[PDB]
């Protein structure tokens, strides 16, 4: 719970982070938040993992229980932040697990840390193809100082997908309520730039200097054409796999924390046998 919350100076910035400080065999589980939310998204997943793993959740610049305005930064800076926390903490070997566009951090972290330190990754509910019209419009709305809130509302609609999902509604409407345009507009510029510059998550992962096992676990998009791009990518890359989780929303970490946990334990166990 909030018993594991700390704060430290990371270069210029005071960042909060979760660390259960569990004294156990590696690798540490590094749970990466997406944009404009914090460690609260992972409270149910931390419960699944707490007794068996050391679990660390960094919050990005301007993120946390008290969001704040900060200067412009991108996934590159998120990566330098994540590693500085891990260096301060004395963590060597880690398994990164990302929420959605936290994936840009995860894949760049894999490159930077290398396959000894970061031998595998798990990406959760991360749009594998380049932006379809509806999502591209969302990003344009987030970037708009007059329409960013409309932006979030449309994304909350897609994310909930017609479900009265109490815990996820709580996360979106309460736990993300204090994030403003400084975050949401940034999230729009960063994600748009990331696709523009890397093509896609699939292309970025394929382009790793050292490819290594990555699994995509997702609940949405729910249509067959999305499963198919995942299966086609998996057919093509030995190191890639996926699992459709069947959860109601964009936040499997919240709505199917037990399922997310068994995939993370599978990967952790594989690394230990290693
Ligand atoms: C927490 C979260 O999902 N954040 C995002 C914020 C803006 C745009 C997209 C996303 C996403 O990660 O899907
Ligand atoms: K319900
Ligand atoms: K495969």
From Swiss-Prot:
The record marks 125 as: Increases basicity of active site His. The active site is at residue 250. Residues 27-149 form the AB hydrolase-1 domain. Changing residue 100 to A: Strongly reduced affinity for substrate. Strongly reduced enzyme activity. Substrate binds at residues 35-37, 99-100, 159. Changing residue 101 to Q: Reduces enzyme activity by about half. This is 1H-3-hydroxy-4-oxoquinaldine 2,4-dioxygenase. It comes from Paenarthrobacter nitroguajacolicus (Arthrobacter nitroguajacolicus). The lineage of its organism: Bacteria, Bacillati, Actinomycetota, Actinomycetes, Micrococcales. The gene is hod.
